[PDB]
Structures are given as structure tokens and as C-alpha cells.
């Protein structure tokens, strides 16, 4: 994508989103990031949506194949699960590489820095979902560390209803429940996040109220699943 204008890459990423061509979307946003300029709020969302959809499809396929493989226990099911797993790891490594070179170090504002650290936690979480070897504990701690830094910034710099703060807490609670085997930590985080957001809703416009309550409902859905 080196020869395409930054603005054209962004425009094409929006077109790919409309066409549900998320692999193209991700490639266009990777090219935009590699132009070296910081990303706007809208552009960060495009980056996130693109890679979340790509890796989301890979995760769904990996779980189908992993389930078939467990029920079987020739080499084909394992081989094909491994192929999908390797492609997923490649996508996660690519996103983490963009965050490390150099999105996070140039992100000074709370909204951008928390967004990218949440992203870093998420893609290490996806690596953790498939990890089974020597570095699985280190992968888990890398997710935890990124989420923790994002939480610390979000609590000092953002209101409790901020959608990025809410989505971060939601995902860190899923990390606790699903990855870290800390379901009590997951439940406490979801409840405390929901309750403090509830008490701040009175400050919001109708549109901001809608944004915040939509994510609070996801916290509620998990608490209902977990308790």
C-alpha cells in the first residue's frame, strides 16, 4: 500500500467496510498506519473494526476445528486447525506490530493511548486463547499488563461512562473470566464498572446516554451469564 495516498487508503477502508470486505479493510488501514502519522478517532475505529472482524472469523473457525479435534481424540483435523491457528497468530502479530511501531509510543491523549492499549490487551488475549506452550503464561501476562495500563489511565483521565473506558473494562473482565481463571475478579470488575457508570449517566446528553447504556448492557449480559 506504499504507493497509495493516505486519504485514498482511508476512503477505500470505508468502502471495504460497506462491502463487508474486512480483509481488504484491514490491509487498507495497515497501509494508512504505515504512513507514520497519528490516527484520528474515526481512523482508530476503522483500524479496530477491520482487524476485529478478520480475527473474529478466524477465532470462530478455530473453535469449530478445535471442537472437532477434541471429539476425535488421521492428521488432517489437527493439520487444518494448526493452519488456521497459524494464520490467526499472524494477524495478531501484525496488529501488535502496528501498535508497537509506532502507534502506542506516539499516543499522548488519554482517548488514543487507552484505545491502543485496549487493542494490545485484546490481541494478546486472542493469542492466549490458542496458546499451549512455553510462552502461554508470558502471553497472558502481556495481555494483563496492557489492560492494566489502560485501566490505570482510564480511571484517572476519563469519566466512568466513557465508551472506551466501558469497553476496556468489559474486555478486561472477559480476560479475567475466560483467560486468567479469575471469575470473581471478572464479576467484581463488571459490577463496579456498571455501578459507577450508572451513577454518571445523569451528566450525559441523550446521544451519549445511548452510547454508554449500550455497553453497560453488555456488562449486564455477562453478569447474568456469570451469576
Amino acid at each position: 500500500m506504499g504507493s497509495m495516498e493516505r486519504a485514498s487508503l482511508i476512503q477505500k477502508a470505508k468502502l471495504a467496510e460497506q462491502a463487508e470486505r474486512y480483509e481488504d479493510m484491514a490491509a487498507f488501514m495497515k497501509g494508512a498506519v504505515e504512513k507514520g502519522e497519528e490516527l484520528s478517532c474515526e481512523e482508530r475505529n476503522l483500524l479496530s473494526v477491520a482487524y476485529k472482524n478478520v480475527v473474529g472469523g478466524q477465532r470462530a473457525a478455530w473453535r469449530v476445528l478445535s471442537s472437532i479435534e477434541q471429539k476425535s481424540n488421521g492428521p488432517e483435523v489437527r493439520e487444518y486447525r494448526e493452519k488456521v491457528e497459524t494464520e490467526l497468530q499472524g494477524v495478531c502479530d501484525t496488529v501488535l506490530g502496528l501498535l508497537d511501531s509506532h502507534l502506542i509510543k506516539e499516543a499522548g491523549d488519554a482517548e488514543s493511548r487507552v484505545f491502543y492499549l485496549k487493542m494490545k490487551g485484546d490481541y494478546y488475549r486472542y493469542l492466549a486463547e490458542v496458546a499451549t506452550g512455553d510462552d502461554k503464561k508470558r502471553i497472558i501476562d502481556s495481555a494483563r499488563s496492557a489492560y492494566q495500563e489502560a485501566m490505570d489511565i482510564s480511571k484517572k483521565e476519563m469519566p466512568p461512562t466513557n465508551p472506551i473506558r466501558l469497553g476496556l473494562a468489559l474486555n478486561f473482565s472477559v480476560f479475567h473470566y475466560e483467560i486468567a481463571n479469575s471469575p470473581e475478579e471478572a464479576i467484581s470488575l463488571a459490577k463496579t464498572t456498571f455501578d459507577e457508570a450508572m451513577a454518571d449517566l445523569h451528566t450525559l446528553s441523550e446521544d451519549s446516554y445511548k452510547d454508554s447504556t449500550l455497553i453497560m448492557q453488555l456488562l449486564r449480559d455477562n453478569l447474568t451469564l456469570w451469576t
Binding site: 479496530s48 476485529k52 472477559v174 453488555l218 456469570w226
Partner: peptide
């Protein structure tokens, strides 16, 4: 099973 953030 649980919900993470989604757009």
C-alpha cells in the same frame, strides 16, 4: 460464551 465489546 461471554460478550466482549463489538461494533
Amino acid at each position: 460464551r461471554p460478550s466482549s465489546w463489538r461494533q
